[PDB]
Amino acid sequence: SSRLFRTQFRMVSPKRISNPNNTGDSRNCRAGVQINDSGAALGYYVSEDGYPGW
Amino acid sequence: TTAQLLAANEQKFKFDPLFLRLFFRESYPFTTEKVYLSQIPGLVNMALYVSPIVSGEVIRSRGGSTSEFTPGYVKPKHEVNPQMTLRRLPDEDPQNLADPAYRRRRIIMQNMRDEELAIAQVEEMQAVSAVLKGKYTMTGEAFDPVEVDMGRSEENNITQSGGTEWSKRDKSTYDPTDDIEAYALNASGVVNIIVFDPKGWALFRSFKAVKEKLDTRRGSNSELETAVKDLGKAVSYKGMYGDVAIVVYSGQYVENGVKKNFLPDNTMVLGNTQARGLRTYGCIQDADAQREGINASARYPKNWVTTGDPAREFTMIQSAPLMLLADPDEFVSVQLA
Numbered sequence: 064s065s066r067l068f069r070t071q072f073r074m075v076s077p078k079r080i081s082n083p084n085n086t087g088d089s090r091n092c093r094a095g096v097q098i099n100d101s102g103a104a105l106g107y108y109v110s111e112d113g114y115p116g117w
Numbered sequence: 118t119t120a121q122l123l124a125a126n127e128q129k130f131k132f133d134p135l136f137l138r139l140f141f142r143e144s145y146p147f148t149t150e151k152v153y154l155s156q157i158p159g160l161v162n163m164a165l166y167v168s169p170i171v172s173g174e175v176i177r178s179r180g181g182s183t184s185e186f187t188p189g190y191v192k193p194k195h196e197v198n199p200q201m202t203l204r205r206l207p208d209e210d211p212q213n214l215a216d217p218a219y220r221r222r223r224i225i226m227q228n229m230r231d232e233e234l235a236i237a238q239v240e241e242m243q244a245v246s247a248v249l250k251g252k253y254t255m256t257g258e259a260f261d262p263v264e265v266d267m268g269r270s271e272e273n274n275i276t277q278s279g280g281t282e283w284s285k286r287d288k289s290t291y292d293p294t295d296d297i298e299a300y301a302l303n304a305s306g307v308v309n310i311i312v313f314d315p316k317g318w319a320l321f322r323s324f325k326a327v328k329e330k331l332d333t334r335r336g337s338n339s340e341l342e343t344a345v346k347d348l349g350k351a352v353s354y355k356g357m358y359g360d361v362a363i364v365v366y367s368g369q370y371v372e373n374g375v376k377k378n379f380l381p382d383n384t385m386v387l388g389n390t391q392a393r394g395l396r397t398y399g400c401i402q403d404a405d406a407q408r409e410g411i412n413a414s415a416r417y418p419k420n421w422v423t424t425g426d427p428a429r430e431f432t433m434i435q436s437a438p439l440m441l442l443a444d445p446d447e448f449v450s451v452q453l454a
Contacts, residue, residue, distance in 0.1 A: 084416075084418070085226075085229065087226060087230070113409060115408070115409075116409060117419070117420075
């Protein structure tokens with residue numbers, strides 16, 4: 064876009080945050096939120112939703 | 118009589134895809150029936166002396182050759198039915214317990230993990246079988262057999278014979294460095310790493326000259342570990358030997374109920390840590406897969422319900438993997454018997 068501001072937002076449904084390929088939960092990556100040695104959260108695993116898809 | 122489940126272990130084998138990791142990187146997915154690999158001879162005769170009169174004998178321009186390959190197909194599947202969900206699980210305590218529907222999301226996870234592990238084992242076996250010998254054959258009971266054959270020179274795959282075998286000749290006054298040089302002379306390109314089956318490593322380090330090459334002040338720069346370093350792990354990155362790196366690989370794959378080792382009983386493999394290797398994935402063939410758009414991808418999962426009399430909700434993974442080596446004669450395989 065050639066508007067004044069290039070910032071855009073997107074509200075993500077909570078169901079799209081989960082482990083890759085439905086692997087088991089780990090010590091550092093629980094329910095799609097990867098956690099370092101401390102309690103901080105580093106990055107999230109946003110899935111892809113296909114409405115005709117199962 | 119009551120009970121409590123305090124602990125419940127899991128049993129596995131030493132599985133680690135070293136050969137896939139080191140030598141096979143930069144995967145290429147391809148939406149094509151068959152792929153090509155081309156080699157150009159690059160061999161120029163020295164110019165024969167010609168009088169300034171005759172002025173002839175044109176020399177042909179060099180031309181290469183091509184090879185055609187096709188990928189296989191692999192699909193393991195699992196199942197789960199309400200008949201086996203009711204009773205109990207071997208990793209659940211008699212107290213508390215879980216619901217007859219939560220036990221349905223443990224068997225599913227176990228199944229998916231087993232499918233992924235089987236696919237990984239297939240990929241590792243395909244990767245290893247190409248390194249040891251130039252060609253490997255892909256076959257099964259329902260799959261029509263196809264063979265992938267990279268062109269590897271006969272000078273490689275050096276197998277020891279009645280003469281020049283390390284086992285027979287004495288461990289004092291013999292140096293194997295002479296041999297590791299003559300064997301490496303056949304390789305095309307610099308070699309940088311050696312892979313030892315554990316018995317081969319045990320046979321190699323027994324030589325007294327090798328133990329001399331460690332504690333010499335200026336005779337070399339190699340540092341090794343002739344003590345015990347790794348006892349349970351599948352790979353053990355030991356020290357360098359002059360310039361080359363030494364690795365001992367002992368991996369396990371199971372065909373039928375038994376366990377088997379990947380490297381066959383004390384082989385030694387030369388090679389380069391930057392060897393050009395290809396990881397190609399074929400086209401998955403499911404008419405429900407081709408709907409999404411997914412094609413020439415790795416590990417397409419799916420599941421469905423059969424609506425049969427005892428029900429059942431299956432689970433499935435399918436990959437269609439292929440392993441290729443762009444330069445086949447760059448490695449050197451030694452029987453070392």
